[PDB]
Ligand binder design. Structure first.
Ligand SMILES: *CC(=O)NCCNC(=O)c1ccc(-c2nc(C(*)=O)cs2)cc1
Ligand SMILES: *CC(=O)NCCNC(=O)c1ccc(-c2nc(C(*)=O)cs2)cc1
Lengths: 141, 10, 141, 10
């Protein structure tokens, strides 16, 4: 429970400081906000091409990570750019919405873990040589 | 290589 | 960066699911919300007694954790109850607001770490024998 | 033991 209790402390203090007119911003806050905004814009700019990407995979309780990695590896087959990273997040979002639509809310945490794995293995190493998430925020935030 | 419309901006 | 990237994934998916009318609630969300509400109510119910508690400590860059532990140990000297736990969070909040008022925003993360330590050492063991944070949420949420 | 007004409720 130590990690949970640390996150509870930071949430309460953030809330209290904001109530008194002070902003105590957490490290990834601007990255989270920029990615939310970038995904919304991506889904409104690229409806047809995004539909073609999301049509490549339908997750069920039986699906293995390899099925997800194969489809996402096609997105990145000839390398990474920030537009493809946004597409990756939007793609995972769409798989989660499909899951909940089909009464398989239980798959959302699995897709989350798959996306984290695929960040760890493929994307983080590119991000660390291309200006970090802070470059993303300056480009897209 | 450009394969998707989101690649154009990069 | 693996932990940060996992938190980015959960933030984006939570946001996207909420945009589509679905709630993907994180484990501590109801505890965070109940504690925010409990601290606000505590500070409005107990102004004089809370002022007497916050007057016991003024943190500066030189202050050691022992000074904080001694004052908080008085709050818990003869045991724990949920009202005293709320007082502890409100107390830390007030120390953080004082810090920012005095242009020592740098102390907020130190106070956060002190509060997490004091949860770990003193409060979590009581919480785990008294119904967990879920009992807090049922009592105060 | 009751020492603070917040203790009354517990
Ligand atoms: C949108 C973005 O990434 N902007 C940052 C500047 N551009 C680049 O860093 C960049 C990255 C990767 C590429 C790739 N080229 C190939 C084929 O087009 C696939 S990814 C281009 C530019
Ligand atoms: C407000 C709260 O904790 N409600 C849950 C039910 N009450 C208790 O669990 C409880 C806990 C601890 C005590 C203590 N007694 C002594 C002296 O009064 C100090 S803390 C009473 C009741």
């Amino acid at each position: 429970m130590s990690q949970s209790n640390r996150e509870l402390v930071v949430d309460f203090l953030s809330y209290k400081l904001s109530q008194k007119g002070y902003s105590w911003s957490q490290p990834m806050a601007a990255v989270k906000q920029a990615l939310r905004e970038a995904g919304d814009e991506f889904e409104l700019r690229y409806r047809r091409a995004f539909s073609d990407l999301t049509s490549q995979l339908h997750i069920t309780p039986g699906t293995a990570y390899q099925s997800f990695e194969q489809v996402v590896n096609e997105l990145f087959r000839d390398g990474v750019n920030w537009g493809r990273i946004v597409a990756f997040f939007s793609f995972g979002g769409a798989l989660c919405v499909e899951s909940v639509d089909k009464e398989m809310q239980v798959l959302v945490s699995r897709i989350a873990s798959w996306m984290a794995t695929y960040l760890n293995d493929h994307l983080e190493p590119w991000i660390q040589e291309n200006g970090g998430w802070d470059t993303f925020v300056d480009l897209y935030g | 290589p450009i394969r998707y419309p989101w690649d154009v901006e990069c």
